[PDB]
């Protein structure tokens, strides 16, 4: 998150922190995700497409910090890693960038809701907020584009939804953005998602209910003028989500 503010997991208690174990045993952060039911976390396929093997991953819930334990957190293996079969990418734009992780602790349990661990509602189909609506984004990604390190403490910020029309203009993204994606940015371009935020939630309050409107997917640079963040538009994937989770 470029700009924004520090936070803790109580303020985003569906947020899941996803890590990968390496051949020789070191563990590194991959991406964010969101708890949509006790046994299911939703994230972005590009985060997993190089290492598609479920045994490689660890998922935490109720974690506020990148490299230390938060009291109350829960740790899970990935029982199934489900990537979208229509995924595609060109160096920039990912299409169908959506993934499901079925989670299971070493005790064979799913998430148990607590003060730090809660689910986030999915949107109704094809039901998104008006462009110009402010929404929130959360993650442990870079705080500056040139940074070498990720922040140790979780961050959040606020960005405004931008119309497909504005985002499709050649000085924005042209044809790279489709109607299965949502753009969102700050009006000053001073805050945005960045590397390491992918997979995480774009949450918007749709008539009082906090809703997973988007999943961080891509963008050119971070907080760069005329280059919004681009998010998977969750309300266009409900059948996919319902099928793969009912599983």
């Amino acid at each position: 998150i470029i700009g924004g503010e520090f936070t803790t997991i109580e303020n985003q208690p569906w947020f899941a922190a996803i890590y990968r174990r390496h051949r020789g045993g070191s563990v590194t952060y991959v991406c964010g995700g969101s708890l949509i039911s006790p046994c299911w976390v939703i994230s972005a396929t590009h985060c997993f497409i190089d290492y598609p093997k479920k045994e490689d991953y660890i998922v935490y819930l109720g974690r506020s910090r990148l490299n230390s334990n938060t009291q109350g957190e829960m740790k899970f293996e990935v029982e199934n890693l489900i990537l979208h079969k229509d995924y595609s990418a060109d160096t920039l734009a990912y299409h169908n960038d959506i993934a499901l992780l079925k989670i299971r602790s070493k005790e064979g349990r799913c998430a148990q809701p607590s003060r730090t661990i809660q689910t986030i509602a999915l949107p109704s189909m094809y039901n998104d907020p008006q462009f110009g609506t402010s929404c929130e984004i959360t993650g442990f990604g870079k705080e500056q584009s040139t940074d070498y390190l990720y922040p140790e403490q979780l961050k959040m910020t606020v960005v405004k939804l931008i119309s497909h029309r504005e985002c499709q203009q050649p000085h924005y993204y042209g044809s790279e953005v489709t109607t299965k994606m949502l753009c969102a940015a700050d009006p000053q371009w001073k805050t945005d998602s960045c590397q390491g935020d992918s997979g995480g939630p774009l949450v918007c309050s749709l008539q009082g209910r906090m809703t997973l409107t988007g999943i961080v997917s891509w963008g050119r640079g971070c907080a760069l003028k005329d280059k919004p963040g681009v998010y998977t538009r969750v309300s266009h994937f409900l059948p996919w989500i319902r099928s793969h989770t009912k599983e």
Binding site: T91, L92, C194, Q195, S198, W218, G221, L224
Partner: peptide, 10 residues
């Protein structure tokens, strides 16, 4: 220039 997700403009 081109052109990666995430990092720099170029």
């Amino acid at each position: 220039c081109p052109a990666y997700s995430x990092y720099l403009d170029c």
